[PDB]
Design a protein around this nucleic acid. Structure first.
Lengths: 228, 148, 71
RNA sequence: GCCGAGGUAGCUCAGUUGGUAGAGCAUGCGACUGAAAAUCGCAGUGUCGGCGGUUCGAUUCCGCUCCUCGGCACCA
RNA sequence: CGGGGGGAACCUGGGGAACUGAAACAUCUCAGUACCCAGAGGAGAGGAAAGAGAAAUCGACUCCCUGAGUAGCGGCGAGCG
RNA sequence: CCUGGUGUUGGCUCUUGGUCGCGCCUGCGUAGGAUAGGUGGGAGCCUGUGAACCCCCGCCUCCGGGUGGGGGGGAGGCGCC
RNA sequence: GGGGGCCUGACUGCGAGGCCUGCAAGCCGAGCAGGGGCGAAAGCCGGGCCUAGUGAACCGGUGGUCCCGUGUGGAAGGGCC
């Protein structure tokens, strides 16, 4: 009855016997882990879906209020105008048919894609057979293709988060900065609640919202009630 | 199957309970025999009847007990011993107390119980714990002395 | 009659037969069994007082025996 | 119609990350075979019924499509 | 103490059939009829509402006319109703 | 006629399968210190071995090695990169 | 009939009025409305160069609709396209 993770402090801090709720959560997560470099909690969880028919291979987003500036980056792909708008709005990687070229050669740094319909085809094809499914060809159905590249990269930097159920039905993302106001954590929490609830593919057949976990990067872990 | 038990506590462990021994099972297989019966207001009550009954019985003994324990534990118990100024030529057996208090003074309590390992006969007087009813003990002051 | 019930009759009729389903799941009837039949229970025994029987009928039975059992 | 099942090179069997394919038997060349068969060595040798598809990448994963087999219920 | 045994037709229940029709004929149909039985009567039967019906009413049961041959019942067909 | 369920048709008992709840435990294509099951957070963790040096042991197999420990201990290691 | 362009009427609502019919069928169509498309536009397009590629009624499915629901609100079931 004695294991191996000094973290045992924080460990005792947590008592997974209850799935409790969103807010109480924000609170105790914060209280829970400010190790080397104050917490950067995260929520992770899974839904009653299935891989086979991609009608459930969801992903997307929902800004969920509160500032930002770093994570799985992106490429703004279009023309001068977009260079300006999307670049300044919130775009680490900035190019279009140009950056596409570069890539074809060897340069590139963007899993996430935001190609506007002014080099949309340019990127989609020129790079189609370049980015491949590593999750990079801007495909019109993943906050990846459209008019306001400025807007998507924009929030990407301004206060973003995204969806992407991994291998067997789980997603990972932030909903309430470190020590940051408990209530705030509650807010982004529920916000994602919905975003998700929405993305929910019509192919579900039972208890959809499954394992609802809020936990921290390196810290405790326990489920919460996307409800009260 | 409200199998009300007479001789049962599982196996022949009498009047311990009532359990479910399915239809015939219970029926002609275990109780026809005659080790119990089945519910009925007649039975359920019956139980209640003798149960209540024992309740009154026990409470009761508790009571006669109390009357004598009080009267006695209060009163002093004196007795005439025969000898020197220590053990007497004879001995003081708690029973001895028994006939002694019993008819010499009034109230009879069975020999058997009481607290007396070796007869005591060291002469003089002792007061000890002689249990009279279950968890209601009677301790008393028996002064005994050479009747000279 | 020498085969009723004891505690209330059961020696009785019956007209039966059938067809085929599908019904409110793709089809109409399917009918063609004008047939007729029987329909009944069981028999068991215990004791008046050191000699007896039972006879009777299943259920009503269990009840009964319990009853005259009361006496 | 439903469900379970079989289908890849002349014959027949083999995989659940898929992400790399044959294998045993007949066919071509070569030792042994002084004949033969058989023996060994090799080669040749292929869509995993069809299609797309999830899927980097799956032929064994998804959904629907052919010919076959077994056993139910369809046309009143 | 009582039964039992009868009785043209009517009564209650008990079991309960082909024709013929549907120009065949298997659901359907003659029908719960013909017909065998038990039993009560002088009539049995039913008979004082877990009824009706939808307005805020009715008010035991039986028999007649009306209720529609409409509501409706079905190889929705012969028909039955 | 044979035939699952089921009612009378009751006691004791050896046992083995599926499925979930949970703790454990597993993850070997070639370059890859290195047997990466994914997808996350994401530059540190720990000192209850005071330690990664070594000891044998409990274990798991595609040599290697992964894992849980008893111990022996004396600012050190690994993550980072 | 042979070639090229662009395009969907190989449209709903409907049709006066006739060929042939004993029933039912089946076949002919200017013309009015919306409504598009052909061409600049005069006018053509309600499938094909035509006469054969066909089946009542039932019963049941489905996509509508959003009329019926059995005291009423719903619903099963449900009426018409």
């Amino acid at each position: 009855p004695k294991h191996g993770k000094r973290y045992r402090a924080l460990l005792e801090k947590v008592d997974p016997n209850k799935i409790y709720t969103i807010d109480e959560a924000a609170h105790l997560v914060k209280e829970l882990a400010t190790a080397k470099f104050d917490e950067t909690v995260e929520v992770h969880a899974k839904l009653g879906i299935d891989p086979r028919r991609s009608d459930q291979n969801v992903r997307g987003t929902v800004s969920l209020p509160h500032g930002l500036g770093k994570q799985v980056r992106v490429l703004a792909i279009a023309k001068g105008e977009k260079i300006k708008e999307a670049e300044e709005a919130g775009a680490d990687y900035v190019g279009g048919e140009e950056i596409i070229q570069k890539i074809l050669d060897g340069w590139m740094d963007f899993d996430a894609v935001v190609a506007t319909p002014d080099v949309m085809g340019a990127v989609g094809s020129k790079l189609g057979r370049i980015l491949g499914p590593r999750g990079l060809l801007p495909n019109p159905k993943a906050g990846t293709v459209g008019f306001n590249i400025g807007e998507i990269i924009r929030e990407i930097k301004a206060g973003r988060i995204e969806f992407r159920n991994d291998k067997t039905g789980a997603i990972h993302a932030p909903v309430g900065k470190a020590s940051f106001p408990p209530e705030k954590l509650a807010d982004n929490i529920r916000a994602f609640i919905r975003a998700l609830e929405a993305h929910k593919p019509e192919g579900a057949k039972g208890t959809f919202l499954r394992s609802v976990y809020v936990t921290t990067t390196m810290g405790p872990s326990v489920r919460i009630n996307p409800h009260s | 199957m409200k199998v009300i038990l007479l001789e049962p506590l599982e196996n022949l462990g009498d009047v311990g309970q009532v359990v479910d021994v399915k239809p015939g099972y219970a029926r002609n297989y275990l109780l026809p025999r005659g080790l119990a019966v089945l519910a009925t207001e007649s039975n359920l009550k019956a139980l209640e009847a003798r149960i209540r009954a024992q309740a009154k019985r026990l409470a009761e003994r508790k009571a006669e007990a109390e009357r004598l324990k009080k009267i006695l534990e209060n009163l002093t118990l004196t007795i005439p011993v025969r000898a020197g100024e220590t053990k007497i030529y004879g001995s003081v057996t708690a029973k001895d107390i028994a006939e002694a208090l019993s008819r010499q003074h009034g109230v009879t309590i069975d020999p058997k119980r009481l607290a007396l390992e070796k007869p005591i006969k060291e002469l003089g007087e002792y007061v000890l714990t002689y249990k009279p009813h279950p968890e209601v003990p009677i301790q008393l002051k028996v002064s005994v002395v050479a009747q000279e | 009659m020498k085969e009723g019930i004891h505690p209330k009759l059961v020696p009785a009729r019956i007209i039966c037969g059938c067809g085929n389903v599908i019904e409110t799941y793709s089809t109409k009837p399917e009918i063609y069994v004008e047939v007729c039949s029987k329909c009944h229970p069981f028999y068991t025994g215990q004791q008046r007082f050191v000699d007896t029987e039972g006879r009777v009928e299943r259920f009503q039975r269990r009840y009964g025996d319990s009853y005259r059992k009361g006496r």
